[PDB]
């Protein structure tokens with residue numbers, strides 16, 4: 001295979017994995033490709049990629065590049081089967097971003113509700129059986145989805161995008177707003193339990209502190 005170096009943002013010691021959810025997304029893509037690569041952290045905007053001596057910089061170009069040039073059969077395809085696997089998480093980070101930046105405590109419930117509404121949209125998607133889901137015993141569509149991840153039972157590009165952002169939301173909102181993702185979002189929790197069991201996700205996460213540091217001067221209410 002090719003010679004690859006991924007440059008990611010460094011954490012507060014200038015060495016550890018810092019909070020950069022697109023860097024984690026690319027780290028996941030390369031890991032899931034099953035390709036050799038090195039990861040370098042930068043105490044400097046990341047991620048950047050060196051692929052056979054060429055510097056690449058535009059994330060979208062990079063993601064397209066990798067999916068197209070690291071292809072089957074040597075490498076797994078990572079594009080999701082269903083376009084909505086991508087589309088479901090579209091406003092979730094923005095709602096979190098407004099919630100975590102709000103400094104008016106009496107507005108907290110309104111911003112939290114707006115975040116919960118997006119989590120509900122995600123939960124519904126994760127509970128709705130995909131068109132390809134067939135119960136192995138009855139051959140009926142299951143009544144509630146059982147698939148591991150967004151698109152099916154493998155990690156896809158959808159998950160490499162969404163998972164890093166959900167980790168940030170989970171960590172930062174718990175730290176600064178005492179927020180827990182409701183237990184009643186059983187679809188969301190099944191997905192998170194499955195994801196946190198995969199090392200491509202957990203071992204590319206920065207330490208929670210790095211994410212807490214990102215929000216330390218925005219999330220304190222006044």
Ligand SMILES: O=C(O)c1cc(S)ccc1[N+](=O)[O-]
Nearest residue numbers: 086087089090093161162165
């Ligand atoms: O980067 C985002 O905020 C994001 C945007 C869209 S349109 C879909 C999924 C996403 N995920 O997964 O994070």
